[PDB]
Amino acid sequence: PTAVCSDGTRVSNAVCCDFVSLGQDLQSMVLQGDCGEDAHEIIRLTFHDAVAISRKLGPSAGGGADGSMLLFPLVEPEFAASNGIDDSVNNLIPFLSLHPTISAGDLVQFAGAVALSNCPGAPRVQFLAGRPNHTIAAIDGLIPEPQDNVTSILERFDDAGGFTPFEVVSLLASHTIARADKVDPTLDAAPFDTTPFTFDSQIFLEVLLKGVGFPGLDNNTGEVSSPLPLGDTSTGGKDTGLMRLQSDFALAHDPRTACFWQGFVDQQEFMSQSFASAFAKLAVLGHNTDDLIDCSEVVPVPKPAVDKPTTFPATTGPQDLELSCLAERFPTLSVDPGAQETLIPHCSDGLENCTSVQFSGPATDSP
Ligand code: HEM
Ligand SMILES: [Ca+2]
Ligand SMILES: [Ca+2]
Ligand SMILES: [Mn+2]
Ligand SMILES: [Mn+2]
């Protein structure tokens, strides 16, 4: 039956109420209301946790969205494909004992939903609760890597949960709030779009620009040339230049995915809704939803989409596009004024000096 939570939220099931205090603690202790580093890493973790499941190999290969990354932190986080996931894992582990009624699987997905809510333009995602509190570690080899080709990526997502090419591209809207710490051993927080604290369609536009250089080294696995490689890190600054992943480039130009990729350019609501639908499917891999309860009402209302239109970043323009989609014309968009590349801020407040919460814990990472 219905009930009302301590914060006034109307819920269809009183067991949803335990998530209210969890959300509050996730914000006060880790996320700090920001679409920042810790939020981004936690959203990345929802994917690393959930995608480790295989129809063809059967249940023993992995239980999907099951908290396996938190419950066996000495196994999957140290597989090569998850290098760097230790930060999010170690940040979430303490919540298992602080909120002992909430399973690890539920914790991972709820933390991702709360993190998304901090990002202007992000959808208010579905949240179903009730994932069991026990599992085993997944096998290695189930997480796509940025050097993988589109056939491989599409097969992996299809085998994980029957995701279509459209749903894959939709999920990759997440790269609108993403940066890389491990791809280039000389760079920290190399952003994938010019607005890494805004859940917008800049990623879709910017991957379609011609690459002209690299923000760091020119030969990292899984990395390709960037259209906006300039940063201030050569003089000690923290505003790393923009990085492009091979996989994002490949998705943007493959015949199976290129029209879906371009279709999100300057289509904020379509992008956010499409991401939401695919992400809800991702969040329940390893579960029959009949065995879960709807606690969507305790996901915070997200920060609204920004007013700013989708635009070409300074020094770029439509003449720089490499287009592959015949089915839809690329829209006419304004160009941001400026003669030199605009530094991409390291922090959501526009500065370089922000710091992030990091708890110590059992998961580790490699140089
Ligand atoms: C083909 C599939 C994917 C590939 C190859 C891929 C690859 C990557 C890589 C290489 C990084 C940088 C990690 C680092 O070096 O620090 C990254 C970051 C990230 N990924 Fe993706 N990813 C994929 C799909 C997804 C999905 C489905 C989601 C979530 C729905 C996601 C969310 C994120 C987020 C939020 C970050 C940023 C973390 C941060 O900024 O701290 N990724 N991904
Ligand atoms: Ca898992
Ligand atoms: Ca963005
Ligand atoms: Mn790290
Ligand atoms: Mn990171």
Side-chain angles (χ1 to χ4, degrees), residues 37 40-41 43-44 46-47 144-146 153 157 171-172 174-175 177-183 192 245 247 251 275 279 282:
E37 178 66 20
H40 300 163
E41 289 284 3
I43 294 162
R44 180 186 172 209
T46 67
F47 172 59
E145 297 184 69
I153 288 166
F157 274 98
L171 287 170
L172 271 291
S174 62
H175 282 190
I177 46 161
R179 313 189 289 185
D181 307 323
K182 297 300 196 173
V183 175
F192 300 158
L245 298 184
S247 43
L251 289 163
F275 175 80
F279 189 74
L282 181 70

PDB file of all heavy atoms in Angstrom, residues 37 40-41 43-44 46-47 144-146 153 157 171-172 174-175 177-183 192 245 247 251 275 279 282, ligand 1:
ATOM      1  N   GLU A  37      33.302  15.096 -11.165  1.00  0.00           N
ATOM      2  CA  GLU A  37      34.080  13.883 -11.348  1.00  0.00           C
ATOM      3  C   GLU A  37      33.424  12.674 -10.687  1.00  0.00           C
ATOM      4  O   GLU A  37      33.292  11.621 -11.299  1.00  0.00           O
ATOM      5  CB  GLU A  37      35.498  14.079 -10.803  1.00  0.00           C
ATOM      6  CG  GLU A  37      36.391  12.847 -10.907  1.00  0.00           C
ATOM      7  CD  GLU A  37      36.722  12.431 -12.319  1.00  0.00           C
ATOM      8  OE1 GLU A  37      36.599  13.278 -13.230  1.00  0.00           O
ATOM      9  OE2 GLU A  37      37.091  11.249 -12.529  1.00  0.00           O
ATOM     10  N   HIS A  40      30.306  11.489 -12.488  1.00  0.00           N
ATOM     11  CA  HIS A  40      30.611  10.867 -13.761  1.00  0.00           C
ATOM     12  C   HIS A  40      31.129   9.448 -13.571  1.00  0.00           C
ATOM     13  O   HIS A  40      30.723   8.525 -14.281  1.00  0.00           O
ATOM     14  CB  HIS A  40      31.645  11.694 -14.499  1.00  0.00           C
ATOM     15  CG  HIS A  40      31.199  13.083 -14.794  1.00  0.00           C
ATOM     16  ND1 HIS A  40      32.084  14.078 -15.130  1.00  0.00           N
ATOM     17  CD2 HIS A  40      29.971  13.650 -14.792  1.00  0.00           C
ATOM     18  CE1 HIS A  40      31.421  15.196 -15.348  1.00  0.00           C
ATOM     19  NE2 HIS A  40      30.139  14.966 -15.141  1.00  0.00           N
ATOM     20  N   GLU A  41      32.033   9.255 -12.620  1.00  0.00           N
ATOM     21  CA  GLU A  41      32.592   7.935 -12.375  1.00  0.00           C
ATOM     22  C   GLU A  41      31.512   6.967 -11.887  1.00  0.00           C
ATOM     23  O   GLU A  41      31.518   5.797 -12.244  1.00  0.00           O
ATOM     24  CB  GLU A  41      33.751   8.015 -11.386  1.00  0.00           C
ATOM     25  CG  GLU A  41      35.001   8.676 -11.958  1.00  0.00           C
ATOM     26  CD  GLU A  41      35.808   7.783 -12.916  1.00  0.00           C
ATOM     27  OE1 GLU A  41      35.382   6.637 -13.206  1.00  0.00           O
ATOM     28  OE2 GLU A  41      36.872   8.252 -13.391  1.00  0.00           O
ATOM     29  N   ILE A  43      28.316   7.121 -12.723  1.00  0.00           N
ATOM     30  CA  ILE A  43      27.514   6.771 -13.889  1.00  0.00           C
ATOM     31  C   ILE A  43      28.255   5.724 -14.746  1.00  0.00           C
ATOM     32  O   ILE A  43      27.661   4.766 -15.222  1.00  0.00           O
ATOM     33  CB  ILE A  43      27.137   8.042 -14.668  1.00  0.00           C
ATOM     34  CG1 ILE A  43      26.210   8.922 -13.819  1.00  0.00           C
ATOM     35  CG2 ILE A  43      26.467   7.686 -15.999  1.00  0.00           C
ATOM     36  CD1 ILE A  43      26.139  10.351 -14.306  1.00  0.00           C
ATOM     37  N   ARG A  44      29.558   5.904 -14.917  1.00  0.00           N
ATOM     38  CA  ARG A  44      30.373   4.898 -15.593  1.00  0.00           C
ATOM     39  C   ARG A  44      30.249   3.519 -14.916  1.00  0.00           C
ATOM     40  O   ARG A  44      30.132   2.496 -15.584  1.00  0.00           O
ATOM     41  CB  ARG A  44      31.817   5.387 -15.600  1.00  0.00           C
ATOM     42  CG  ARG A  44      32.816   4.464 -16.270  1.00  0.00           C
ATOM     43  CD  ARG A  44      34.208   5.030 -16.044  1.00  0.00           C
ATOM     44  NE  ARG A  44      35.278   4.149 -16.488  1.00  0.00           N
ATOM     45  CZ  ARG A  44      36.499   4.100 -15.968  1.00  0.00           C
ATOM     46  NH1 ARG A  44      36.839   4.845 -14.924  1.00  0.00           N
ATOM     47  NH2 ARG A  44      37.386   3.285 -16.514  1.00  0.00           N
ATOM     48  N   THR A  46      27.701   2.311 -13.300  1.00  0.00           N
ATOM     49  CA  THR A  46      26.430   1.633 -13.570  1.00  0.00           C
ATOM     50  C   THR A  46      26.562   0.729 -14.798  1.00  0.00           C
ATOM     51  O   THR A  46      26.001  -0.379 -14.830  1.00  0.00           O
ATOM     52  CB  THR A  46      25.212   2.583 -13.773  1.00  0.00           C
ATOM     53  OG1 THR A  46      25.338   3.365 -14.969  1.00  0.00           O
ATOM     54  CG2 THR A  46      25.006   3.472 -12.564  1.00  0.00           C
ATOM     55  N   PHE A  47      27.303   1.212 -15.799  1.00  0.00           N
ATOM     56  CA  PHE A  47      27.539   0.459 -17.023  1.00  0.00           C
ATOM     57  C   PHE A  47      28.484  -0.720 -16.786  1.00  0.00           C
ATOM     58  O   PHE A  47      28.204  -1.839 -17.208  1.00  0.00           O
ATOM     59  CB  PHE A  47      28.079   1.395 -18.105  1.00  0.00           C
ATOM     60  CG  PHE A  47      28.528   0.679 -19.335  1.00  0.00           C
ATOM     61  CD1 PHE A  47      27.636  -0.111 -20.054  1.00  0.00           C
ATOM     62  CD2 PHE A  47      29.818   0.784 -19.785  1.00  0.00           C
ATOM     63  CE1 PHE A  47      28.032  -0.784 -21.192  1.00  0.00           C
ATOM     64  CE2 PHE A  47      30.226   0.081 -20.947  1.00  0.00           C
ATOM     65  CZ  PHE A  47      29.324  -0.691 -21.618  1.00  0.00           C
ATOM     66  N   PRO A 144      32.903  -3.681 -23.215  1.00  0.00           N
ATOM     67  CA  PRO A 144      33.494  -3.119 -24.431  1.00  0.00           C
ATOM     68  C   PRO A 144      34.600  -2.135 -24.117  1.00  0.00           C
ATOM     69  O   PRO A 144      34.524  -1.427 -23.107  1.00  0.00           O
ATOM     70  CB  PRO A 144      32.325  -2.372 -25.095  1.00  0.00           C
ATOM     71  CG  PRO A 144      31.117  -2.893 -24.492  1.00  0.00           C
ATOM     72  CD  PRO A 144      31.467  -3.371 -23.115  1.00  0.00           C
ATOM     73  N   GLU A 145      35.600  -2.089 -24.989  1.00  0.00           N
ATOM     74  CA  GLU A 145      36.739  -1.203 -24.862  1.00  0.00           C
ATOM     75  C   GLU A 145      36.787  -0.273 -26.061  1.00  0.00           C
ATOM     76  O   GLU A 145      36.242  -0.591 -27.119  1.00  0.00           O
ATOM     77  CB  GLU A 145      38.024  -2.015 -24.767  1.00  0.00           C
ATOM     78  CG  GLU A 145      38.077  -2.903 -23.544  1.00  0.00           C
ATOM     79  CD  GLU A 145      39.391  -3.603 -23.446  1.00  0.00           C
ATOM     80  OE1 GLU A 145      40.400  -2.923 -23.196  1.00  0.00           O
ATOM     81  OE2 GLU A 145      39.415  -4.819 -23.668  1.00  0.00           O
ATOM     82  N   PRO A 146      37.424   0.888 -25.905  1.00  0.00           N
ATOM     83  CA  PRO A 146      37.306   1.924 -26.936  1.00  0.00           C
ATOM     84  C   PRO A 146      37.978   1.587 -28.249  1.00  0.00           C
ATOM     85  O   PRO A 146      37.661   2.226 -29.249  1.00  0.00           O
ATOM     86  CB  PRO A 146      37.957   3.150 -26.278  1.00  0.00           C
ATOM     87  CG  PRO A 146      38.862   2.562 -25.215  1.00  0.00           C
ATOM     88  CD  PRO A 146      38.108   1.385 -24.700  1.00  0.00           C
ATOM     89  N   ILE A 153      31.053  -4.183 -30.730  1.00  0.00           N
ATOM     90  CA  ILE A 153      30.291  -3.445 -29.747  1.00  0.00           C
ATOM     91  C   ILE A 153      28.815  -3.820 -29.826  1.00  0.00           C
ATOM     92  O   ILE A 153      28.168  -4.094 -28.817  1.00  0.00           O
ATOM     93  CB  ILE A 153      30.465  -1.936 -29.974  1.00  0.00           C
ATOM     94  CG1 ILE A 153      31.867  -1.510 -29.563  1.00  0.00           C
ATOM     95  CG2 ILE A 153      29.428  -1.124 -29.213  1.00  0.00           C
ATOM     96  CD1 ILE A 153      32.247  -0.132 -30.040  1.00  0.00           C
ATOM     97  N   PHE A 157      26.566  -5.745 -26.849  1.00  0.00           N
ATOM     98  CA  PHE A 157      25.344  -5.177 -26.281  1.00  0.00           C
ATOM     99  C   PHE A 157      24.127  -6.062 -26.586  1.00  0.00           C
ATOM    100  O   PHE A 157      23.241  -6.217 -25.749  1.00  0.00           O
ATOM    101  CB  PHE A 157      25.133  -3.749 -26.783  1.00  0.00           C
ATOM    102  CG  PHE A 157      25.850  -2.696 -25.980  1.00  0.00           C
ATOM    103  CD1 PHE A 157      27.067  -2.184 -26.389  1.00  0.00           C
ATOM    104  CD2 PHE A 157      25.266  -2.177 -24.851  1.00  0.00           C
ATOM    105  CE1 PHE A 157      27.693  -1.182 -25.686  1.00  0.00           C
ATOM    106  CE2 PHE A 157      25.899  -1.177 -24.133  1.00  0.00           C
ATOM    107  CZ  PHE A 157      27.113  -0.684 -24.549  1.00  0.00           C
ATOM    108  N   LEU A 171      22.605   5.073 -25.345  1.00  0.00           N
ATOM    109  CA  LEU A 171      23.394   4.941 -24.120  1.00  0.00           C
ATOM    110  C   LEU A 171      24.656   5.783 -24.166  1.00  0.00           C
ATOM    111  O   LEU A 171      25.079   6.305 -23.138  1.00  0.00           O
ATOM    112  CB  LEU A 171      23.742   3.469 -23.854  1.00  0.00           C
ATOM    113  CG  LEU A 171      22.587   2.583 -23.384  1.00  0.00           C
ATOM    114  CD1 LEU A 171      22.994   1.118 -23.403  1.00  0.00           C
ATOM    115  CD2 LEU A 171      22.111   2.973 -22.000  1.00  0.00           C
ATOM    116  N   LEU A 172      25.263   5.885 -25.345  1.00  0.00           N
ATOM    117  CA  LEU A 172      26.483   6.651 -25.502  1.00  0.00           C
ATOM    118  C   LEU A 172      26.270   8.155 -25.429  1.00  0.00           C
ATOM    119  O   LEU A 172      27.237   8.906 -25.381  1.00  0.00           O
ATOM    120  CB  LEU A 172      27.267   6.232 -26.752  1.00  0.00           C
ATOM    121  CG  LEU A 172      28.265   5.083 -26.519  1.00  0.00           C
ATOM    122  CD1 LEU A 172      29.432   5.535 -25.640  1.00  0.00           C
ATOM    123  CD2 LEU A 172      27.633   3.834 -25.939  1.00  0.00           C
ATOM    124  N   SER A 174      25.687   9.305 -22.785  1.00  0.00           N
ATOM    125  CA  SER A 174      26.411   9.503 -21.530  1.00  0.00           C
ATOM    126  C   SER A 174      27.770  10.158 -21.716  1.00  0.00           C
ATOM    127  O   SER A 174      28.286  10.780 -20.788  1.00  0.00           O
ATOM    128  CB  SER A 174      26.629   8.153 -20.857  1.00  0.00           C
ATOM    129  OG  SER A 174      27.419   7.311 -21.691  1.00  0.00           O
ATOM    130  N   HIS A 175      28.372  10.024 -22.894  1.00  0.00           N
ATOM    131  CA  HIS A 175      29.669  10.638 -23.121  1.00  0.00           C
ATOM    132  C   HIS A 175      29.604  12.157 -23.222  1.00  0.00           C
ATOM    133  O   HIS A 175      30.626  12.824 -23.278  1.00  0.00           O
ATOM    134  CB  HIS A 175      30.392   9.961 -24.286  1.00  0.00           C
ATOM    135  CG  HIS A 175      31.006   8.652 -23.898  1.00  0.00           C
ATOM    136  ND1 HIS A 175      31.869   7.946 -24.710  1.00  0.00           N
ATOM    137  CD2 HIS A 175      30.876   7.919 -22.766  1.00  0.00           C
ATOM    138  CE1 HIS A 175      32.247   6.842 -24.085  1.00  0.00           C
ATOM    139  NE2 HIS A 175      31.651   6.796 -22.910  1.00  0.00           N
ATOM    140  N   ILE A 177      28.878  13.792 -20.672  1.00  0.00           N
ATOM    141  CA  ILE A 177      29.344  14.181 -19.333  1.00  0.00           C
ATOM    142  C   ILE A 177      30.520  13.294 -18.935  1.00  0.00           C
ATOM    143  O   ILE A 177      30.636  12.864 -17.821  1.00  0.00           O
ATOM    144  CB  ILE A 177      28.218  14.142 -18.258  1.00  0.00           C
ATOM    145  CG1 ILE A 177      27.414  12.850 -18.358  1.00  0.00           C
ATOM    146  CG2 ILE A 177      27.311  15.348 -18.417  1.00  0.00           C
ATOM    147  CD1 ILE A 177      26.614  12.493 -17.147  1.00  0.00           C
ATOM    148  N   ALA A 178      31.410  13.034 -19.868  1.00  0.00           N
ATOM    149  CA  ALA A 178      32.475  12.061 -19.663  1.00  0.00           C
ATOM    150  C   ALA A 178      33.839  12.603 -20.024  1.00  0.00           C
ATOM    151  O   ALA A 178      33.993  13.381 -20.971  1.00  0.00           O
ATOM    152  CB  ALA A 178      32.186  10.827 -20.479  1.00  0.00           C
ATOM    153  N   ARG A 179      34.828  12.131 -19.274  1.00  0.00           N
ATOM    154  CA  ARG A 179      36.225  12.467 -19.471  1.00  0.00           C
ATOM    155  C   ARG A 179      37.052  11.198 -19.245  1.00  0.00           C
ATOM    156  O   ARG A 179      36.552  10.223 -18.686  1.00  0.00           O
ATOM    157  CB  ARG A 179      36.668  13.573 -18.511  1.00  0.00           C
ATOM    158  CG  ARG A 179      35.686  14.743 -18.446  1.00  0.00           C
ATOM    159  CD  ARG A 179      36.228  15.934 -17.664  1.00  0.00           C
ATOM    160  NE  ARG A 179      36.289  15.621 -16.249  1.00  0.00           N
ATOM    161  CZ  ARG A 179      36.629  16.503 -15.310  1.00  0.00           C
ATOM    162  NH1 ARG A 179      36.995  17.731 -15.648  1.00  0.00           N
ATOM    163  NH2 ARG A 179      36.636  16.143 -14.038  1.00  0.00           N
ATOM    164  N   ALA A 180      38.308  11.236 -19.683  1.00  0.00           N
ATOM    165  CA  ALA A 180      39.222  10.086 -19.583  1.00  0.00           C
ATOM    166  C   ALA A 180      40.440  10.387 -18.733  1.00  0.00           C
ATOM    167  O   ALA A 180      41.148  11.363 -18.969  1.00  0.00           O
ATOM    168  CB  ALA A 180      39.672   9.629 -20.968  1.00  0.00           C
ATOM    169  N   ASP A 181      40.693   9.485 -17.790  1.00  0.00           N
ATOM    170  CA  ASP A 181      41.830   9.556 -16.883  1.00  0.00           C
ATOM    171  C   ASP A 181      42.910   8.508 -17.195  1.00  0.00           C
ATOM    172  O   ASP A 181      44.061   8.698 -16.811  1.00  0.00           O
ATOM    173  CB  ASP A 181      41.366   9.351 -15.441  1.00  0.00           C
ATOM    174  CG  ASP A 181      40.240  10.279 -15.055  1.00  0.00           C
ATOM    175  OD1 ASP A 181      40.270  11.450 -15.504  1.00  0.00           O
ATOM    176  OD2 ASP A 181      39.349   9.816 -14.315  1.00  0.00           O
ATOM    177  N   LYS A 182      42.534   7.400 -17.848  1.00  0.00           N
ATOM    178  CA  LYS A 182      43.454   6.276 -18.086  1.00  0.00           C
ATOM    179  C   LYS A 182      43.830   6.096 -19.555  1.00  0.00           C
ATOM    180  O   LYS A 182      44.835   5.476 -19.852  1.00  0.00           O
ATOM    181  CB  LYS A 182      42.856   4.963 -17.563  1.00  0.00           C
ATOM    182  CG  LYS A 182      42.623   4.923 -16.062  1.00  0.00           C
ATOM    183  CD  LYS A 182      43.919   5.125 -15.290  1.00  0.00           C
ATOM    184  CE  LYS A 182      43.790   4.716 -13.832  1.00  0.00           C
ATOM    185  NZ  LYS A 182      45.114   4.752 -13.136  1.00  0.00           N
ATOM    186  N   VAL A 183      43.035   6.612 -20.485  1.00  0.00           N
ATOM    187  CA  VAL A 183      43.322   6.380 -21.892  1.00  0.00           C
ATOM    188  C   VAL A 183      44.709   6.899 -22.275  1.00  0.00           C
ATOM    189  O   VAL A 183      45.462   6.222 -22.973  1.00  0.00           O
ATOM    190  CB  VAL A 183      42.253   7.021 -22.792  1.00  0.00           C
ATOM    191  CG1 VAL A 183      42.652   6.871 -24.263  1.00  0.00           C
ATOM    192  CG2 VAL A 183      40.891   6.370 -22.542  1.00  0.00           C
ATOM    193  N   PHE A 192      35.384  14.454 -23.321  1.00  0.00           N
ATOM    194  CA  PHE A 192      34.912  13.989 -24.623  1.00  0.00           C
ATOM    195  C   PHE A 192      34.054  15.032 -25.351  1.00  0.00           C
ATOM    196  O   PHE A 192      33.863  14.930 -26.566  1.00  0.00           O
ATOM    197  CB  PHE A 192      34.140  12.675 -24.495  1.00  0.00           C
ATOM    198  CG  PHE A 192      34.938  11.525 -23.911  1.00  0.00           C
ATOM    199  CD1 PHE A 192      34.275  10.456 -23.336  1.00  0.00           C
ATOM    200  CD2 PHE A 192      36.324  11.489 -23.952  1.00  0.00           C
ATOM    201  CE1 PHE A 192      34.967   9.388 -22.797  1.00  0.00           C
ATOM    202  CE2 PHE A 192      37.017  10.413 -23.404  1.00  0.00           C
ATOM    203  CZ  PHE A 192      36.335   9.370 -22.838  1.00  0.00           C
ATOM    204  N   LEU A 245      37.449   9.188 -28.574  1.00  0.00           N
ATOM    205  CA  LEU A 245      37.566   7.743 -28.557  1.00  0.00           C
ATOM    206  C   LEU A 245      37.338   7.157 -29.941  1.00  0.00           C
ATOM    207  O   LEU A 245      36.461   7.580 -30.688  1.00  0.00           O
ATOM    208  CB  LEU A 245      36.542   7.117 -27.603  1.00  0.00           C
ATOM    209  CG  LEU A 245      36.668   7.498 -26.126  1.00  0.00           C
ATOM    210  CD1 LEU A 245      35.634   6.721 -25.333  1.00  0.00           C
ATOM    211  CD2 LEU A 245      38.079   7.247 -25.590  1.00  0.00           C
ATOM    212  N   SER A 247      35.947   4.385 -30.532  1.00  0.00           N
ATOM    213  CA  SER A 247      34.628   3.774 -30.576  1.00  0.00           C
ATOM    214  C   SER A 247      33.535   4.798 -30.882  1.00  0.00           C
ATOM    215  O   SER A 247      32.592   4.504 -31.617  1.00  0.00           O
ATOM    216  CB  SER A 247      34.350   3.055 -29.262  1.00  0.00           C
ATOM    217  OG  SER A 247      34.760   3.849 -28.168  1.00  0.00           O
ATOM    218  N   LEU A 251      31.201   4.663 -34.162  1.00  0.00           N
ATOM    219  CA  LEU A 251      29.739   4.686 -34.088  1.00  0.00           C
ATOM    220  C   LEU A 251      29.165   5.837 -34.920  1.00  0.00           C
ATOM    221  O   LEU A 251      28.107   5.712 -35.533  1.00  0.00           O
ATOM    222  CB  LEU A 251      29.267   4.809 -32.641  1.00  0.00           C
ATOM    223  CG  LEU A 251      29.466   3.565 -31.772  1.00  0.00           C
ATOM    224  CD1 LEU A 251      29.372   3.919 -30.285  1.00  0.00           C
ATOM    225  CD2 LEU A 251      28.447   2.494 -32.168  1.00  0.00           C
ATOM    226  N   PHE A 275      18.118   8.204 -24.162  1.00  0.00           N
ATOM    227  CA  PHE A 275      19.042   7.749 -23.146  1.00  0.00           C
ATOM    228  C   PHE A 275      18.271   7.131 -21.980  1.00  0.00           C
ATOM    229  O   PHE A 275      18.594   6.035 -21.527  1.00  0.00           O
ATOM    230  CB  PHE A 275      19.930   8.884 -22.636  1.00  0.00           C
ATOM    231  CG  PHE A 275      20.813   8.459 -21.501  1.00  0.00           C
ATOM    232  CD1 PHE A 275      21.976   7.761 -21.733  1.00  0.00           C
ATOM    233  CD2 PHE A 275      20.445   8.706 -20.190  1.00  0.00           C
ATOM    234  CE1 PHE A 275      22.767   7.328 -20.689  1.00  0.00           C
ATOM    235  CE2 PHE A 275      21.240   8.267 -19.141  1.00  0.00           C
ATOM    236  CZ  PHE A 275      22.402   7.588 -19.393  1.00  0.00           C
ATOM    237  N   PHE A 279      18.747   3.353 -20.775  1.00  0.00           N
ATOM    238  CA  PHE A 279      19.409   3.254 -19.485  1.00  0.00           C
ATOM    239  C   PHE A 279      18.549   2.461 -18.481  1.00  0.00           C
ATOM    240  O   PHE A 279      19.074   1.676 -17.689  1.00  0.00           O
ATOM    241  CB  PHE A 279      19.738   4.662 -18.963  1.00  0.00           C
ATOM    242  CG  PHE A 279      20.605   4.661 -17.741  1.00  0.00           C
ATOM    243  CD1 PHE A 279      21.958   4.363 -17.829  1.00  0.00           C
ATOM    244  CD2 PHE A 279      20.063   4.925 -16.492  1.00  0.00           C
ATOM    245  CE1 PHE A 279      22.754   4.342 -16.705  1.00  0.00           C
ATOM    246  CE2 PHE A 279      20.858   4.906 -15.365  1.00  0.00           C
ATOM    247  CZ  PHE A 279      22.198   4.614 -15.477  1.00  0.00           C
ATOM    248  N   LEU A 282      19.274  -1.072 -19.255  1.00  0.00           N
ATOM    249  CA  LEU A 282      20.596  -1.400 -18.734  1.00  0.00           C
ATOM    250  C   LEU A 282      20.559  -1.674 -17.219  1.00  0.00           C
ATOM    251  O   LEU A 282      21.153  -2.633 -16.721  1.00  0.00           O
ATOM    252  CB  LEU A 282      21.556  -0.255 -19.031  1.00  0.00           C
ATOM    253  CG  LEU A 282      23.012  -0.426 -18.584  1.00  0.00           C
ATOM    254  CD1 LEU A 282      23.716  -1.461 -19.412  1.00  0.00           C
ATOM    255  CD2 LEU A 282      23.739   0.919 -18.662  1.00  0.00           C
TER     256      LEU A 282
HETATM  257  C1  HEM B   1      31.034   0.985 -26.484  1.00  0.00           C
HETATM  258  C2  HEM B   1      30.733   1.267 -25.201  1.00  0.00           C
HETATM  259  C3  HEM B   1      31.628   2.159 -24.340  1.00  0.00           C
HETATM  260  C4  HEM B   1      32.954   2.367 -24.408  1.00  0.00           C
HETATM  261  C5  HEM B   1      34.015   1.741 -25.332  1.00  0.00           C
HETATM  262  C6  HEM B   1      33.295   3.322 -23.384  1.00  0.00           C
HETATM  263  C7  HEM B   1      34.547   3.815 -23.123  1.00  0.00           C
HETATM  264  C8  HEM B   1      34.880   4.726 -22.144  1.00  0.00           C
HETATM  265  C9  HEM B   1      36.216   5.165 -21.821  1.00  0.00           C
HETATM  266  C10 HEM B   1      37.481   4.671 -22.533  1.00  0.00           C
HETATM  267  C11 HEM B   1      36.127   6.062 -20.824  1.00  0.00           C
HETATM  268  C12 HEM B   1      37.274   6.805 -20.115  1.00  0.00           C
HETATM  269  C13 HEM B   1      37.730   6.056 -18.857  1.00  0.00           C
HETATM  270  C14 HEM B   1      39.031   6.632 -18.358  1.00  0.00           C
HETATM  271  O1  HEM B   1      40.072   6.446 -19.029  1.00  0.00           O
HETATM  272  O2  HEM B   1      39.027   7.279 -17.287  1.00  0.00           O
HETATM  273  C15 HEM B   1      34.726   6.204 -20.503  1.00  0.00           C
HETATM  274  C16 HEM B   1      34.217   7.037 -19.547  1.00  0.00           C
HETATM  275  C17 HEM B   1      32.902   7.164 -19.192  1.00  0.00           C
HETATM  276  N1  HEM B   1      31.874   6.326 -19.631  1.00  0.00           N
HETATM  277 FE1  HEM B   1      31.937   5.262 -21.421  1.00  0.00          FE
HETATM  278  N2  HEM B   1      32.154   3.694 -22.719  1.00  0.00           N
HETATM  279  C18 HEM B   1      31.113   2.987 -23.275  1.00  0.00           C
HETATM  280  C19 HEM B   1      29.802   3.049 -22.880  1.00  0.00           C
HETATM  281  C20 HEM B   1      29.307   3.756 -21.810  1.00  0.00           C
HETATM  282  C21 HEM B   1      27.964   3.665 -21.286  1.00  0.00           C
HETATM  283  C22 HEM B   1      26.890   2.723 -21.855  1.00  0.00           C
HETATM  284  C23 HEM B   1      27.875   4.502 -20.236  1.00  0.00           C
HETATM  285  C24 HEM B   1      26.709   4.828 -19.302  1.00  0.00           C
HETATM  286  C25 HEM B   1      25.436   4.735 -19.682  1.00  0.00           C
HETATM  287  C26 HEM B   1      29.152   5.150 -20.099  1.00  0.00           C
HETATM  288  C27 HEM B   1      29.462   6.127 -19.189  1.00  0.00           C
HETATM  289  C28 HEM B   1      30.683   6.723 -19.042  1.00  0.00           C
HETATM  290  C29 HEM B   1      30.922   7.885 -18.232  1.00  0.00           C
HETATM  291  C30 HEM B   1      29.897   8.697 -17.464  1.00  0.00           C
HETATM  292  C31 HEM B   1      32.377   8.169 -18.308  1.00  0.00           C
HETATM  293  C32 HEM B   1      33.108   9.331 -17.674  1.00  0.00           C
HETATM  294  C33 HEM B   1      33.784   9.040 -16.346  1.00  0.00           C
HETATM  295  C34 HEM B   1      34.442  10.307 -15.854  1.00  0.00           C
HETATM  296  O3  HEM B   1      34.353  11.350 -16.557  1.00  0.00           O
HETATM  297  O4  HEM B   1      35.062  10.284 -14.758  1.00  0.00           O
HETATM  298  N3  HEM B   1      30.006   4.670 -21.046  1.00  0.00           N
HETATM  299  N4  HEM B   1      33.989   5.364 -21.297  1.00  0.00           N
END
